[PDB]
Write a protein that binds this ligand. Sequence first.
Ligand SMILES: Nc1nc2c(ncn2[C@@H]2O[C@H](COP(=O)(O)OP(=O)(O)OP(=O)(O)O)[C@@H](O)[C@H]2O)c(=O)[nH]1
Ligand SMILES: [Mg+2]
Ligand SMILES: [Mg+2]
Lengths: 97, 86, 56, 360, 74, 271, 81
Amino acid sequence: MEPYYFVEVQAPADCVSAVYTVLARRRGHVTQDAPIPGSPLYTIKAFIPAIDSFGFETDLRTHTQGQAFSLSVFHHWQIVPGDPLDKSIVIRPLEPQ
Amino acid sequence: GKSSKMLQHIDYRMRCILQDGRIFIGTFKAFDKHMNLILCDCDEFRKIKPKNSKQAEREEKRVLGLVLLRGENLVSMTVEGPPPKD
Amino acid sequence: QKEDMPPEHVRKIIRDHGDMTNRKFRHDKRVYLGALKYMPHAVLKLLENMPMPWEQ
Amino acid sequence: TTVYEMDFLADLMDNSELIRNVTLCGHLHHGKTCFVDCLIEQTHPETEQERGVGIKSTPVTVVLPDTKGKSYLFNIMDTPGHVNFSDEVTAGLRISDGVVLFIDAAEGVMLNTERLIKHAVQERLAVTVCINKIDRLILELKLPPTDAYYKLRHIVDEVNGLISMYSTDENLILSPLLGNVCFSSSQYSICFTLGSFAKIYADTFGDINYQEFAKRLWGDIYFNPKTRKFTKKAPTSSSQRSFVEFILEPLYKILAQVVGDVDTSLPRTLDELGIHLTKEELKLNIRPLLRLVCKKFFGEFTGFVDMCVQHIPSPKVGAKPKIEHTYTGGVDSDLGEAMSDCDPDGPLMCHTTKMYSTDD
Amino acid sequence: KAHPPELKKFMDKKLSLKLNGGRHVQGILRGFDPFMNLVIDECVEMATSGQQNNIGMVVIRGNSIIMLEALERV
Amino acid sequence: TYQRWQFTLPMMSTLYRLANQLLTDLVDDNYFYLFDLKAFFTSKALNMAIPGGPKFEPLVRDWNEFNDINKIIIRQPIRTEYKIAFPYLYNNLPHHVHLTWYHTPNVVFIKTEDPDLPAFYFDPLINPISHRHSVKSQEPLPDDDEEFELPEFVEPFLKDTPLYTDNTANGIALLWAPRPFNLRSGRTRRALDIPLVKNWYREHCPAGQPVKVRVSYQKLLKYYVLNALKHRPPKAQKKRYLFRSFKATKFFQSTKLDWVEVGLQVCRQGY
Amino acid sequence: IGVPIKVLHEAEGHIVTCETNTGEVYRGKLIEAEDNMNCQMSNITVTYRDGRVAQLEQVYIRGSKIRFLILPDMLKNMLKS
RNA sequence: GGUUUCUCUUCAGAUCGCAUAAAUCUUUCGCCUUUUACUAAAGAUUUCCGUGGAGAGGAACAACCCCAAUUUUUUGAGGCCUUGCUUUGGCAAGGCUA
Ligand SMILES: Nc1nc2c(ncn2[C@@H]2O[C@H](COP(=O)(O)OP(=O)(O)OP(=O)(O)O)[C@@H](O)[C@H]2O)c(=O)[nH]1
Ligand SMILES: [Mg+2]
Ligand SMILES: [Mg+2]
C-alpha cells in the first residue's frame, strides 16, 4: 500500500485540458471540475500517487505559462496494482515498470 | 476669542477649589466640555492651603493622585505651581 | 550670468577659419590641434540629441 | 556580520482580562502578512522576502484601541498558509485561544481554508472570519454592487455549512450580525464590521443608535425611505437590500470617485465625507491616494479588534475548556484547576512549542 | 446622545435605591427609560426609623436618582 | 528644467491607447515563472539551461551510493526544470543559487469591448454565481413590528453621486497597465534610458519563428541577465562638471543653433 | 467626547475609585462606563459619611451623582493635549 | 511669510539610474607561431554618462436664533431645637417644619 495526494488546481477556462493531460501521464484520476462562482476560473480536484507527485506542480505551471497552480495534501493509502511476491517478475533496472 | 487662555493654565500647576470647598493641587493636563478635570499626582488638602506660614503648611492633606472630577462642581481655578518637566 | 551670443557670431568665426590654411590665423593652429582630445565628447553630445522623426 | 509604555504593557499583562490570544490563519496568499504589517505601522510609526511565501510563523503582541478606546493587548500568531507548512499552524493552534480565518473575496474557500476550519473546530477554539481582499470585487472583477452582495453571502454560507459539517453542536453560525466577520482590504486600509460601519454612520451624521442600526444591515432587510423604517420584503420599488444601499454602494462610489474622477469630482466628494487633504497629498498616485483616503475615512482597525474582543475567550475565561485536550489528566486534584485559575501564582505550568534560532 | 441605562442585564433584579433626602428603598428593577428614570415593582422604602414598608410599583425618578445596588449577582 | 510631470487621467488614457502597439498585454507576473532574473541566476549557477533561456559558461568547471541503479525507483525522469524550481532538494552542491518561487494571485481583470455599457457590469465572461446550498439559513434577524426608525437626516452616505461616469471604466483599466502608464506623475527620464523593445524579447514561447530569431531572443535575454547580475552600486562619487568648468572660462561662449548646423560644424572640425 | 470621559471609559477594567456628590467613596474594579458617566462597578469597597467601610457586589450610578474619581498610576502616560 | 529660475560652495546611493558602457590587476579558459587587438568565466578595483542631500547668493513671480430637573453662565439642598463630642472654637445624630 502506498499513499495518495489530493491536488486542487486553479485554472483559466481554456487550460483545463492541459492539466488533464498532465494528470494522465502520472496516473491521475481527476475527480471533479467546477466553475468558481463569480470568477473567470475553474477549480479541479484530483488524486495522484505521491510517487508521481514529484515535480507535478512545476510541470503543470510550465506547460500552461504559470496560469494554473496546484497544492497537494496526503489523503489516503491504496493498493499498488502489483503482486509484491512473484519471482517470475524481473525488473529492467532503469526503464519504468 | 483666542482659545488660548485655557491652555495657558493647561499643562501647568493648578489649585482647584470645587463646590465642596476643599483644595485639589495638581497638574492641569487638560479640560473638557463640562469643565471636567483629569489631573494626576493631585493632593487633597482640606484645612488650609499653606502660604508662607510661620506656624505650618501641612495639615489635613492626602495624596489623591490621578483625580478625574466632573465639571459639575468646578468653582475656582488658580495657579498653584509651575510645570515639572517630567 | 553669461547670456547667449547671437548665432551669426559662431557662423562667421567658423566660416572664416575655414580650413586652417590661410596664414592669417596660424596661431589657432595650436589650439585647433590640442582640442582633439575632447572631440569624442562633442560627438557623443551631438548624437545623443538627434531630432527624432516626428520633428523637422 | 517604550519608557512610560512598556510599564503600561506590563500592567496589561497583569490584568489578564484585557488580553486576547488569536491565530491568524487561512489559505495561501490570502492577506495575512500584509494585515500584520499595515497593523504594526498603525501602532508603530517607528529566504522569505525573496520567496514571497512565508514558511515559518511569526508572533506579534501589540496594544490596540477598540471602538470605545479601551486598550487591549493582542497576541497575534501570523502563520504560513502553504498547505505543506500546516505544521506551523498546529503550533499556534495550541498556544492560542481563537482563530481569525482570512478568506479571499475573489476565490472564496479552497483547500487550506476548509482544512484549517477543521483543525480549528477539532481543537475547540473560537472561530472568526475576515473576508479580505474586497477591492478585487470592485476594481478588478467589476461587479454590480448587488452581485458583490451575492458573492459575500455565498462565501459566508459555505464556510457556515462546513463548520457545521465538522462540528455537531449548532452553538454558533457565522454572520456579521453576531460580529463574526470583518470585511477587509489589507492594502487599502479598510476593515469594518457592521458594528463599526454603523458607528461611523452615527458619529458623522446625527445621533442614531449605532447598535440597533447594526442589527439591521446584513441579510435581506430592505428599507423604505418614506417610513424611515426597515422592513422585511415589502418594497416593490425593485430596490436593494439594506446592505447594498447602505454599505456597498457608498463604498463603490468612494472607490469609483478616487480612481476614475480624481481630477474633477474628488474634492467635492471628499468634502461631502469630511476628509480634508492637502494639495501635496492629492498629488499621490492612485493606489497610495486610495489607501490614504480610505484610512482617513474608515479609521484604523476597529472592525477587527471589535469582532475579536467580542468573541475571544480571554485566557482567564480561557483555560478551562482547553485543558481537557492539552493536559494529560485535565483536572484531577492539583494542577488542572491551578492552571484553570490562570493566576500569576505558584504552579508555573507553561507549554513551549517553538524554537526560533538566533541568527548568530 | 440619548444613551439609555445599561439595565438590560440588570433588568428583573432586586436592588436597593438610595436617592436624595437620604431616601432608601428596596425594589425590583425590571425596566426604565433613557433619562435614567426607573420603574421598579416591589418597592419597600427603608425609612430612617428602620421600618421597611412596601409600596409596590412606582416611577423611580432618575432626576434625583443617586444610586441603585442590586441584591443578585448580575 | 523639465522634471516632474503630472497629468490628467484622460491624458493618460489616450496616451495608453496610442502606445498600445508597442506594449505587452500581460497583466501579472506568473507568466515569468521560471523566466525571471532569479531563475536565470540559478540556471547559470548550476550550468543547466531551461528551454528558451540563455546559456552561460560554467561557473567553476568517482563512486556514490545514492545513484546505485538497482536501488532507485524511476517513475518520472527528473529534468532540469525541476532542478531549477527547487535548487536544494534536487541538487548536490547548490552554490550561488537564488531560490525562486512565486504563486502570485492570478489577477482577474476583464477588458471591456465598448465604452457603452456601464463600468460595473456583470460580464458574460465571469461564471454565474448561482450559489446554491440547503434551505440557506435564517438569521438572528431582529424583526420589525417592535420599533425602529431613521432620523430623517441620515441617508445613503452619498446618493447625490452616480456610480460611474465616462471616466471610471478607463480609470480602472489604467490601474493594471505597464509601468509608465499605470502612474500619474513621476520624474522625466532621459531618452536613451528608455528601452522600447525589452518587454518583447522577455517573452516565453515565440512559437514558430525561424531559428534565427529564436537564437536572437536567447542572446538578448543573456545580455539582460548579465546586466542585472553584475550590478555594482555607485560606491564612489567625484563630480567634475566638464561643461560648467568650460563655460566659466573666458574662452567659451554659448548659443542656440539648428541641430543640423552644429552637426556640420562638428564634422568640419573633426576633419 | 472629552479627554476626561475618554480616560474614564478607558479606565474600565483597571482598579479605580470615585467620590460621590453626597460625600461617600466607592472603589473597585472597572465594570462598565459610558459617555453619559453612568458608572457600573463590581466587588467595590464603600466608605460612608462617617467612614464605615464595607463591600459591595455590583452597582450602577448616574453620572451627575459622582463628584471626583481617582485612577491608578497608569493613565498619565493623548499626550498632545 | 512660498514656487520657478541662474549661479557658487558642500555631503551620499548599500539591492539602481525600472537604464546599463568601457578600463586596470590577478587566476583559469579558447583562439595560435610573436606582441597588441581578442574569447568568456570568477574575484578584486577604477573611469565615464546621469541622479540625490545640504547650504549661499542672486533673480522672476505669488503676498505686507432658540434653552435646560442626573454633571456647571435659573435650580425648591432651606432654617433652627436638642443631644453627644472634642480645651472654646467646631464635628456628628435625631426631630420640628411651611
Ligand atoms: N488586491 C488586494 N491584494 C491584497 C490585499 N491585501 C493583501 N493583498 C495581497 O497580499 C500579498 C502579500 O502577502 P500575503 O498574501 O499577505 O502573505 P500571506 O497571505 O500570509 O501568504 P503566505 O505568506 O504564503 O502564507 C500580495 O500579494 C497582495 O496580493 C488587498 O487588500 N487587495
Ligand atoms: Mg506570509
Ligand atoms: Mg622579435
